[PDB]
Symmetry: D2
Subunit: 295 residues, 4 copies
């Protein structure tokens, strides 16, 4: 037997950083969870019990805190690129670093209509993520994403004209509830190294904002023919607005809300045009995915 692939590192490293404006007194906080896995000439740690090739996972944890102390942590695309580059430059035998960052929301509170200088609220569990792969001699590959964005529309979703055969019981509909948790990922053109990532810094936050805005507006305004059709419209728009993106991937559950027939009870009407009370279904759920690129 032989080692075909190997990677190791530290997961679930929680990090908080505060910035304090000396002039204005305003403070800004960032909180993230970081995972770093390394690859390289490490096979002998597995095959021969040779620990000499191992950067201890505890040391990887220390390096994450030190790097956050000495560099900006925003945008996460930049921080992840700095952190990954560190490992391949510092250790001759480490040839790839894989960095995943999940950013948690701490939104400034408004008190009496004015933004508070040092108080924050977690408004929803929506995340902004990055995956950064730094590979010696092959540059920096970055996938940015948003996830945990949960939405619902109460009308203006349809689903009819699908294949009907002996396995089919679903009725066609021209008016249904559509609810989903959005997972959207945009993959950047390969960057040659840290200098090139730095040169595009302003585009990272702007593209995240665009992706979010397009997602919400398209969902709200599309008279949806299917989850498939609506998600493709989202992806098209994002690609049109940022040339440095190569592909956009969406993964959307269809979280079902079922009509409840109450006609057995005193002829109560609660289906079709009379539907008011529905039963949200925890499982099963539809799952629809697509990756859109340039023609």
């Amino acid at each position: 037997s032989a080692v075909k692939a190997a990677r190791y590192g530290k997961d679930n490293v929680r990090v908080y950083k505060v910035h304090k404006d000396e002039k204005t007194g305003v403070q800004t906080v960032y909180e993230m969870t970081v995972c770093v896995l390394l690859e390289g000439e490490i096979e002998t740690s597995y095959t021969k019990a040779d620990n000499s090739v191992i950067v201890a996972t505890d040391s990887i944890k220390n390096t994450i805190y030190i790097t956050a102390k000495q560099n900006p942590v925003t945008p996460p695309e930049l921080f992840g690129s700095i952190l990954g580059t560190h490992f391949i430059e510092k250790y001759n035998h480490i040839h790839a670093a894989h960095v995943n960052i999940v950013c948690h929301r701490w939104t400034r509170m408004d008190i009496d209509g004015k933004p508070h200088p040092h108080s924050f609220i977690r408004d929803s569990e929506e995340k902004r993520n990055v995956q950064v792969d730094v590979v010696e001699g092959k540059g920096i590959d970055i996938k940015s994403s948003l996830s945990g964005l949960t939405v619902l529309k109460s009308t203006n979703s349809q689903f009819w004209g699908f294949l009907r055969d002996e396995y089919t019981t679903l009725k066609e509909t021209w008016d249904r509830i559509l609810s989903t948790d959005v997972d959207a990922t945009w993959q950047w053109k390969n960057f040659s190294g840290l200098q090139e990532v730095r040169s595009h810094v302003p585009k990272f936050d702007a593209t995240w904002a665009t992706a979010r805005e397009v997602t919400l507006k398209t969902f709200a305004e599309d008279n949806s023919a299917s989850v498939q059709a609506t998600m493709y419209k989202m992806a098209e728009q994002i690609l049109a607005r940022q040339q440095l993106i190569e592909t956009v991937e969406y993964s959307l559950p269809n979280k079902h809300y079922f009509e409840i027939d109450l006609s057995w009870h005193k002829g109560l009407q609660n289906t079709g045009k009379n539907a008011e009370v529905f039963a949200p279904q925890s499982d099963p759920n539809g799952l629809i995915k697509c990756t859109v690129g340039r023609s």
Copy 2:
């Protein structure tokens, strides 16, 4: 042996209801999770296998949907009082109904600065809850609450002057991070029945809003001497603003963020006035509770 206490019913009943304004086209959605447990002359179902005294839990589930079809579901204090009253009036041998409702957020989306007629977003996992106990001959007891409100302030929290003995290692501090998940409950004066609950309907939403506003403002503005001292200030204010409340209870975890000493690494300064990067601690956590009433 004898049955000393018994209650039974249906838990985790998910319910969604939509309201459609015929004039304006605007739709509004409500989504809740409901639990109903009954008590009464039911001991023989346990001791003698006499199912004749049992309202099947499946029927309780049906009753929740039927009741939501025929009545307003907001404010939840009213819906819970209607639902509980139904069981004690309908069934001669049922003498108490216990109704718990958890309301989930579906906040109207703003698209292009304008509120959308039928699209919603889940903004955070904060809940608004009620517990309603309807007891034959003893009226209606309602406890309203908010929970899952997660906040953080980066300065203006202190903790010094506590008891020091041979079990104490904690250093006094004049500047720390304070973060918590707020659970706040206000208990209403007993109501004589449904007519009296209906007479106070406007107070329910207004008191929830007041409780939330007082919580957020006090947390943001108090130069906190301890979690104990800050939470008492919150409770005092709520009692002063609504005379029909008898007690206010707060339960607050103290979610710790620890300094990281980096001085071992090239003399890096990251403690006290130089602290920028911290380690959020998942566990353990402080837990502080208090119930405040009228003197």
Copy 3:
């Protein structure tokens, strides 16, 4: 306003302890999660920012580790009584301590049919818990429990003869699946203090074992008329087997498995006596409770 009730302390304190037999080389591990809340003359910490009355929650955490170092951690009824007693004896102004312990399973591995000296497996997420309330001048109250014991029987459960009215759709049945997660609590006679708890030490593990055995055998062997009837039989037996128990409480969900009518597809028969494939339902669920005491 006035403080009506107050308690504070440390939650989610994870503790592991190893015992090493010097003679045999055999090692035994214990892992628990502990919560301790104190009450006493502490109202001024809330009302006047007087921290002098506060035993810091960090110190409570230290005390849990120190106590585990110096005393046996098993049975948990004893450890909880030692820990709670410590706080009321050490601090003049603390008058009650509330200790909750959750014990996690680490079961010795059998390798080649022989018990291994120092290797363990987590066999299921079933827990053994205690709640110990130590109150100055009122002795020690202990509630012991098991929870997270998940079972299923595929036949020999019935449910017929329940109340039928205009809210009822459920069909009577003489053969259904019964599945539940068992939560069972036995409350001990009040103990005068630590000496009396020590005098009964052997009864704690034996009573836990009896409670578990009775639960499993009764569930397996009863041709169940309802969840109500089966759970009462369990409670009766436990009370008969241990005189120092005052009450037994059971809380059982009824986790539904629904038949799937497949007759629409080529007349496939999958209901009643032909039922083979079922749909487990995540929610809603029945919830049945009872507390049984001595006549």
Copy 4:
């Protein structure tokens, strides 16, 4: 823009099946959660709102129940291969089916030392999984795995001789606790189709059992030089015992248990050879992976 990749289907489909032995009265239950995603000539559902190419996800759900009614559900490698093959044979324009199955434990109860005919217990949350990819013209690829197997050894784990530099604070050790949750996957040689999968049916359960046995014995008996070294020994053995496996992949967290220095308290000794009480750490954790194949 163009569709580069697309797949869609149903997730979280819970299924239970019972087998009833007519002769002996013995019943056996199986419970699983199934996910099926399809690929094929479906791009126009995304680009042109052409639902004619869509097999509704509701129909996929129906097909899972029908297939479970008409075929054995064990071993899961076989059931997954039957289910995936169905979709590519039935629908001309569907060219790949991806089937994931998670099997939940229902272990027969022993009552009075004898196996009960129809009562079961969930012994731990360990799962047995399969991923089956059925691709038109390219056969059937199966990855089998076990996951959620949580173990701990209290001694006979070491970690010394790793790289030490200016980022390193970790002390070398010759005696530590090692605890992990095991995720192990074995990938089978490609099968030409269903006939070939059927021909190897007995090997599936036997190989799962071997993988589990090797994992547990190696963990218990290895005087571990590192997680890397121990996991490689596991993988080597599995490959040696089953020739139809091409690769074995392990993913193991290192769940840390930290010493607690109590010397500040009356000189209490609780470190090194005196360590008895430890603090389990919820996060961060090491994460070690490797894929082993044939030389």
